[PDB]
Amino acid sequence: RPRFSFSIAAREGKARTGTIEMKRGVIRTPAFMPVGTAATVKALKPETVRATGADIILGNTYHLMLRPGAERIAKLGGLHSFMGWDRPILTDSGGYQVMSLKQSEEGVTFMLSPERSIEIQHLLGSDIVMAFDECTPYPATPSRAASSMERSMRWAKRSRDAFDSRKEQAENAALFGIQQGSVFENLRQQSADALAEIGFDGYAVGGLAVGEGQDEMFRVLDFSVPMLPDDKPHYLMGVGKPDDIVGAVERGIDMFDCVLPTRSGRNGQAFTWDGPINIRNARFSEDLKPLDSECHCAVCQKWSRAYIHHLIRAGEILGAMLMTEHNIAFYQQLMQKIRDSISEGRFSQFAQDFRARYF
Amino acid sequence: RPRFSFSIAAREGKARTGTIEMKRGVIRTPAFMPVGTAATVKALKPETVRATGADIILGNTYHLMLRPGAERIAKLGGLHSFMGWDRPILTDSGGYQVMSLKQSEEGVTFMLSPERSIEIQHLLGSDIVMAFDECTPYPATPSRAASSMERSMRWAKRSRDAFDSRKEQAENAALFGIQQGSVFENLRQQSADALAEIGFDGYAVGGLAVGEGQDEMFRVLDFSVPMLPDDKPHYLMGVGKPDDIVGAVERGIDMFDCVLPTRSGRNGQAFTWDGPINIRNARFSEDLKPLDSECHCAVCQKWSRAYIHHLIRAGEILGAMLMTEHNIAFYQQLMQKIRDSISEGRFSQFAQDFRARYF
Ligand SMILES: [Zn+2]
Ligand SMILES: [Zn+2]
């Protein structure tokens, strides 16, 4: 297996399905990445994450640097060893926290800079390294957006140099750049242009899912994703709801991460093919059906809504475990159905069917 | 398989090892019963509980009556179906809450009476039904102890009549009586005498583990357990720490339940053959050894102290899951070692070895 390869097996319009080959394994695209910010996918064993179908998971530079520390994890053998996941791991750079949570051209003191970010991600043993950026807040005036975008592009250049400066990293991991530019077409193009001239193994669409509404997110995607090199993966960061994912794949996105399936699970929100449900609602107190009647996950093969209703209302940890396993399995099943319909040339129909049923 | 059979395969002094056969399965004794008060063993799937070696688990009349309700569980097919455990289930009667949390000869209003308790346990589909009692608080004067003990014996008689009055229950489940009498020899004897004249499938030692100290608990056991019919199981309620269990088996106890392995797990306390440890302590932050170097559980085969240290300090649910799985597996391994050494006639040596190492 090589450091990094991306092969497209099939297309339908802008939608693509294929595979990313990396040393630690293969990634089926379009791909959903469960998030596991504290060196765990919340409430789940990595075996369980894998069993649900995930090919890769996401970790985070900002949180791990704080606890337990990147150096400490390095000393303990790296993130894979530490949390017991031997498959690829993508780590975010901290660029979202730069928005989510004293800044200057050098970096941000919470101290994270392009160089420190890339080093921390090296200490973790990340397989896919994200460039250190600034997620531009929304709304933003064209001026702010531009100035923000330009700094990230300078930061993307330093991230590259930093990555390239470390042999073990350069030879064994991959580096993705992140496009900014808010909702502005010319800024997005300038950003894509800068990123491609620098050169990355993959390209993320950053700066969305920051409060703009799905309509506006899809508009921006319409013009932004074709700006990215067609022959590399396209990652839409932090997205999203099932319908967000479907619409984004329709516009050229290959990769996703989102806290929804895990967070929603713990909160008692379950995704179904008929739409999301709040299992705490009293209508489910004696519902013997599974969370979803077609879902193939172990939860839905064994436990009833009624049981998981009680668990969640009682604040039982098993409730969190079961909801989370189902939600992530659901998300992976969605990704499988998307992959299959694109391979078979019926993704357009699937997407319509799905929306008709989901909504 | 019969409604209930207890066979002793081997003895060593007062210690016995054997098997309880019930319709839903076989129970190896001396046995440890994980507790699962809210229709779950906290942080664990029943598969996982079973994998650790448990033959039977404990549920509770008081809590289930409150949430989700006994009638509702009955309507949903019974506790086994509801929580996904098809092996025997023992349910406590509520007698501890009578002490732990307006009373009269008829019962206790929190309304639980011998009759309601037995009916609720019938609604749950319990395999081993506990008589409704009053756990006498400690310390107690001889007068109070006696009056308390006498009421429970009257309540034990009504529990029997109630159980016997329901065909499906009488033919498919078993009923255990519970000895009271505080720390007083004559009261304990009067209680054992009353219980045996009524007649039960098994006999519990109640009223201990109420603050009296292990020395005094073992003293009372010394004279109380031979008062119980030798040919039926002897259950020490709510006990206990590993060393408590070993000393109690040395004095004739066949069954145990305790919240320790689960509660302690969530709190970050791990049992080891060298004694309990507080995994949150900073000495473990970079400890690559498993929780215990000889433990056979999946946790100890895959994860390090360092990892579980981080998980617990970070308030991650997986930390609770992993600690709990280990703790319960540990308890079951202890029970297996006790069974094996009694079968082999070396339980005395084991007990000494264990204490030498544990302390
Ligand atoms: Zn499911
Ligand atoms: Zn273990």
Side-chain angles (χ1 to χ4, degrees), chain B residues 271 290-292 295 297-300 322-323 325-327 329-330 333:
Chain B
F271 296 90
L291 291 179
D292 182 304
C295 174
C297 88
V299 176
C300 287
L322 291 189
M323 288 284 297
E325 180 170 358
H326 164 79
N327 274 350
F330 183 86
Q333 274 172 252

Side-chain angles (χ1 to χ4, degrees), chain A residues 78-94:
Chain A
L79 189 55
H80 292 89
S81 179
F82 184 61
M83 67 181 297
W85 172 274
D86 64 9
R87 276 181 185 276
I89 289 164
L90 190 150
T91 48
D92 201 356
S93 66

Side-chain angles (χ1 to χ4, degrees), chain A residues 136-143 145-147:
Chain A
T136 305
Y138 172 87
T141 68
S143 165
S147 299

Side-chain angles (χ1 to χ4, degrees), chain A residues 295 297 300 326:
Chain A
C295 174
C297 88
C300 287
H326 164 79

Side-chain angles (χ1 to χ4, degrees), chain A residues 63-66 68-74 76-96 101 104-105 107-108 110 112-143 145-166 169-185 187-189 191-196 198-234:
Chain A
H63 306 264
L64 293 168
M65 90 177 158
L66 293 186
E71 280 82 11
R72 184 173 278 177
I73 286 169
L76 297 177
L79 189 55
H80 292 89
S81 179
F82 184 61
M83 67 181 297
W85 172 274
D86 64 9
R87 276 181 185 276
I89 289 164
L90 190 150
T91 48
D92 201 356
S93 66
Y96 183 78
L101 305 168
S104 59
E105 191 62 30
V108 193
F110 285 95
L112 234 33
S113 65
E115 294 86 4
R116 181 49 183 166
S117 194
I118 299 319
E119 166 188 54
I120 285 165
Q121 288 180 75
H122 166 71
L123 292 167
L124 294 176
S126 180
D127 298 281
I128 302 183
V129 176
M130 293 313 288
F132 185 64
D133 64 326
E134 154 157 48
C135 174
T136 305
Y138 172 87
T141 68
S143 165
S147 299
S148 177
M149 181 270 283
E150 292 157 5
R151 168 164 286 170
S152 314
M153 299 303 97
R154 294 191 295 268
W155 283 2
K157 175 46 155 152
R158 283 161 59 188
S159 298
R160 172 46 88 182
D161 289 344
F163 184 94
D164 289 349
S165 85
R166 199 177 286 103
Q169 193 164 38
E171 282 166 17
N172 292 292
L175 187 68
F176 287 24
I178 302 162
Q179 185 200 46
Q180 301 295 337
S182 193
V183 295
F184 306 109
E185 178 156 39
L187 304 196
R188 290 269 163 195
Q189 183 73 68
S191 191
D193 288 349
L195 291 178
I198 294 166
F200 292 94
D201 297 301
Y203 299 83
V205 171
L208 299 172
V210 291
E212 76 268 15
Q214 191 192 82
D215 288 348
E216 183 85 325
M217 186 183 71
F218 288 172
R219 163 187 115 71
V220 178
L221 287 171
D222 286 347
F223 57 72
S224 295
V225 187
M227 295 168 188
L228 309 175
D230 177 76
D231 70 340
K232 312 277 200 224
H234 309 332

